[PDB]
Amino acid sequence: SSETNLTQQSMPNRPNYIGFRDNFVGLMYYNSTGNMGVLAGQASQLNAV
Amino acid sequence: VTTDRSQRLTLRFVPVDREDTTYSYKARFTLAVGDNRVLDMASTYFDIRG
Amino acid sequence: LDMTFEVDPMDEPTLLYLLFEVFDVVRVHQPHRGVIEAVYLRTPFSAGN
Amino acid sequence: GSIPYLDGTFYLNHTFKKVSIMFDSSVSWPGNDRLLTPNEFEIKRSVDG
């Protein structure tokens, strides 16, 4: 606190909106052979994906 | 000797149930020798990750 | 095939995103209960080739 | 040094990641859904789910 510090100016922080992407883009792994999803006939276990 | 058909060489199975305890683990499979095959049990093993 | 894109310079490193358009098709077969057989053919770049 | 092309004395075999074979561009070989999932011989894996 000081006589000069009476003169401080503030500006609002920049707006920033956060949420999930459209259609939940990116929430499930598609097109990754490292993390491939499965839909397989039990009990042959041949993945159809 | 060899078939003209679509048919896998190696099959991988996952448990139909798992039981887990202090001193043991039990895993249960349905092994499935489908039609026009024969399986030598020497060709089988339990593959464990831990 | 050879191609060449003349593009405006940018101070950012950028990517040319080039879609070779194809057919990317699957046929799904279900001969007995619990069995899915699926067969795929991307028709050029067909596939991993 | 040794000339692996003539001497035998190979090394670098461990550098292969995968290979694919394709007749007439569409006839993936051996095909017939033989191998654990593919249309290609996956020699080694950097990540295994």
Coordinates of C-alpha atoms in Angstrom, one line a residue:
Chain A
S1 CA 0.0 0.0 0.0
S2 CA 1.3 3.5 -0.9
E3 CA 0.2 6.9 -2.3
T4 CA 1.4 5.9 -5.8
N5 CA -0.3 2.4 -5.5
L6 CA -3.8 4.2 -5.3
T7 CA -3.3 4.6 -9.1
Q8 CA -3.2 0.9 -10.0
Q9 CA -5.5 -0.2 -12.9
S10 CA -7.1 -3.6 -13.3
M11 CA -8.4 -5.3 -16.5
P12 CA -10.7 -8.4 -16.6
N13 CA -9.0 -11.7 -17.2
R14 CA -9.6 -13.0 -20.8
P15 CA -12.7 -15.2 -21.2
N16 CA -11.9 -18.9 -21.5
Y17 CA -14.7 -21.5 -22.1
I18 CA -13.9 -25.1 -21.4
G19 CA -15.9 -28.3 -22.1
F20 CA -16.0 -31.5 -24.2
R21 CA -15.6 -31.1 -28.0
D22 CA -18.4 -31.3 -30.5
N23 CA -20.0 -34.8 -30.6
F24 CA -17.4 -35.9 -27.9
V25 CA -14.5 -35.8 -30.5
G26 CA -11.4 -37.4 -29.0
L27 CA -13.0 -39.1 -26.0
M28 CA -12.6 -42.6 -27.5
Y29 CA -9.6 -44.0 -29.4
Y30 CA -10.4 -44.5 -33.1
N31 CA -7.7 -45.2 -35.7
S32 CA -5.1 -46.2 -33.2
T33 CA -3.6 -49.7 -33.5
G34 CA -2.1 -49.1 -30.0
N35 CA -5.6 -48.9 -28.4
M36 CA -8.0 -50.6 -30.8
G37 CA -11.5 -51.2 -29.6
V38 CA -13.1 -54.7 -29.9
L39 CA -16.4 -56.2 -31.0
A40 CA -15.8 -59.9 -31.1
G41 CA -18.0 -63.0 -31.4
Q42 CA -17.5 -64.9 -28.1
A43 CA -16.3 -67.7 -28.1
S44 CA -14.4 -67.6 -31.5
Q45 CA -12.9 -64.2 -30.3
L46 CA -12.3 -62.9 -33.9
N47 CA -12.4 -59.1 -33.5
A48 CA -14.8 -57.7 -36.2
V49 CA -13.2 -54.1 -35.8
Chain B
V1 CA -3.5 -81.0 -46.5
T2 CA -4.4 -77.3 -46.2
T3 CA -7.9 -75.6 -46.4
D4 CA -8.9 -73.1 -49.1
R5 CA -11.1 -71.3 -46.4
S6 CA -10.8 -68.3 -44.2
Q7 CA -9.6 -69.7 -40.9
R8 CA -7.2 -68.4 -38.1
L9 CA -4.0 -70.2 -37.1
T10 CA -3.7 -69.0 -33.5
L11 CA -6.8 -68.3 -31.3
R12 CA -6.7 -66.1 -28.1
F13 CA -9.3 -66.5 -25.4
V14 CA -10.2 -64.3 -22.4
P15 CA -11.7 -65.6 -19.2
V16 CA -15.5 -66.2 -18.9
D17 CA -14.7 -65.7 -15.2
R18 CA -11.8 -64.6 -13.0
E19 CA -11.5 -65.3 -9.2
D20 CA -8.8 -63.6 -7.2
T21 CA -7.6 -64.4 -3.6
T22 CA -4.8 -63.8 -1.1
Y23 CA -2.8 -66.9 -2.2
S24 CA -4.3 -68.0 -5.6
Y25 CA -5.9 -66.9 -8.9
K26 CA -8.4 -68.9 -10.9
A27 CA -9.2 -68.3 -14.6
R28 CA -11.9 -70.1 -16.6
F29 CA -12.2 -70.4 -20.4
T30 CA -14.5 -71.9 -23.0
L31 CA -12.1 -73.6 -25.4
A32 CA -13.9 -73.9 -28.7
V33 CA -12.7 -76.5 -31.3
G34 CA -15.1 -75.5 -34.1
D35 CA -16.1 -77.8 -37.0
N36 CA -13.5 -79.2 -39.4
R37 CA -10.6 -78.6 -37.0
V38 CA -8.5 -80.7 -34.6
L39 CA -6.6 -79.1 -31.7
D40 CA -3.4 -80.6 -30.3
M41 CA -3.3 -79.5 -26.6
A42 CA 0.5 -79.1 -26.9
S43 CA -0.4 -76.0 -29.0
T44 CA -2.0 -74.3 -25.9
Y45 CA -0.7 -72.2 -23.0
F46 CA -1.9 -69.7 -20.4
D47 CA -0.4 -66.3 -21.2
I48 CA 0.0 -64.2 -18.0
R49 CA 0.7 -60.5 -17.6
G50 CA 1.4 -59.0 -14.2
Chain C
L1 CA 2.1 -40.2 -59.3
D2 CA 3.9 -36.9 -58.5
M3 CA 2.2 -33.6 -57.2
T4 CA 3.4 -30.2 -56.1
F5 CA 1.6 -27.6 -54.0
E6 CA 2.7 -24.0 -54.2
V7 CA 1.5 -22.4 -50.9
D8 CA 1.9 -19.1 -49.1
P9 CA 4.8 -18.9 -46.6
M10 CA 3.9 -19.0 -42.8
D11 CA 6.2 -18.6 -39.8
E12 CA 4.4 -21.7 -38.3
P13 CA 5.4 -25.2 -39.4
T14 CA 2.3 -26.6 -41.1
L15 CA 1.0 -29.8 -42.7
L16 CA -0.4 -30.5 -46.1
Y17 CA -3.4 -32.7 -45.4
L18 CA -3.9 -34.8 -48.5
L19 CA -6.9 -37.2 -48.8
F20 CA -6.5 -39.7 -51.5
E21 CA -10.2 -40.4 -51.9
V22 CA -11.1 -44.1 -52.2
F23 CA -13.8 -46.6 -51.2
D24 CA -13.2 -47.8 -47.6
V25 CA -15.8 -50.6 -47.3
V26 CA -16.6 -53.5 -45.0
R27 CA -19.0 -56.5 -45.4
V28 CA -20.2 -58.2 -42.2
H29 CA -21.4 -61.8 -42.0
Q30 CA -23.1 -63.6 -39.1
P31 CA -23.5 -67.3 -40.0
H32 CA -24.4 -68.8 -36.6
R33 CA -25.3 -67.3 -33.2
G34 CA -22.5 -65.3 -31.6
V35 CA -20.3 -65.3 -34.8
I36 CA -19.2 -62.1 -36.5
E37 CA -17.0 -62.4 -39.6
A38 CA -16.1 -59.0 -41.1
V39 CA -14.1 -58.4 -44.3
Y40 CA -12.6 -55.1 -45.4
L41 CA -11.3 -53.6 -48.7
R42 CA -10.0 -50.1 -49.1
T43 CA -9.8 -50.1 -52.9
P44 CA -6.6 -48.2 -53.9
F45 CA -4.1 -48.0 -51.0
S46 CA -5.6 -51.5 -50.4
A47 CA -4.4 -51.7 -47.5
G48 CA -1.1 -51.3 -45.7
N49 CA 0.0 -51.5 -49.3
Chain D
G1 CA 35.2 -55.3 -42.2
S2 CA 32.9 -58.4 -42.7
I3 CA 30.7 -58.1 -45.8
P4 CA 27.3 -59.5 -44.6
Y5 CA 26.1 -59.7 -48.3
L6 CA 28.7 -62.4 -49.0
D7 CA 30.2 -63.7 -45.7
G8 CA 27.0 -64.6 -43.9
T9 CA 27.7 -62.5 -40.7
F10 CA 24.2 -60.9 -40.7
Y11 CA 23.0 -58.5 -38.0
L12 CA 20.3 -55.7 -38.2
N13 CA 17.5 -58.4 -38.3
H14 CA 16.2 -56.9 -35.1
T15 CA 15.6 -53.6 -36.9
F16 CA 12.5 -54.8 -38.8
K17 CA 9.0 -53.7 -37.5
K18 CA 6.6 -55.3 -40.0
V19 CA 6.1 -56.5 -43.6
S20 CA 3.2 -56.9 -46.0
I21 CA 2.7 -58.8 -49.2
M22 CA 0.1 -57.9 -51.8
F23 CA -0.7 -59.6 -55.1
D24 CA -2.5 -57.6 -57.9
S25 CA -2.7 -54.8 -55.3
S26 CA -5.9 -56.2 -53.6
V27 CA -5.1 -59.9 -52.9
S28 CA -3.4 -59.5 -49.5
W29 CA -1.2 -62.5 -48.8
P30 CA -1.7 -65.0 -47.1
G31 CA -5.1 -63.3 -46.3
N32 CA -7.8 -65.8 -45.3
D33 CA -7.8 -64.2 -41.9
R34 CA -4.8 -66.5 -41.0
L35 CA -2.7 -64.2 -38.7
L36 CA -3.6 -62.8 -35.3
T37 CA -5.5 -59.8 -36.7
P38 CA -3.9 -58.5 -39.9
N39 CA -3.3 -58.3 -43.6
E40 CA 0.5 -58.2 -42.7
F41 CA 3.4 -59.8 -40.7
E42 CA 3.9 -57.8 -37.6
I43 CA 7.5 -58.8 -36.6
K44 CA 7.8 -56.8 -33.4
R45 CA 5.7 -54.4 -31.2
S46 CA 6.7 -51.2 -29.5
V47 CA 3.3 -51.2 -27.5
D48 CA 1.1 -54.3 -26.9
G49 CA -2.5 -54.0 -25.7

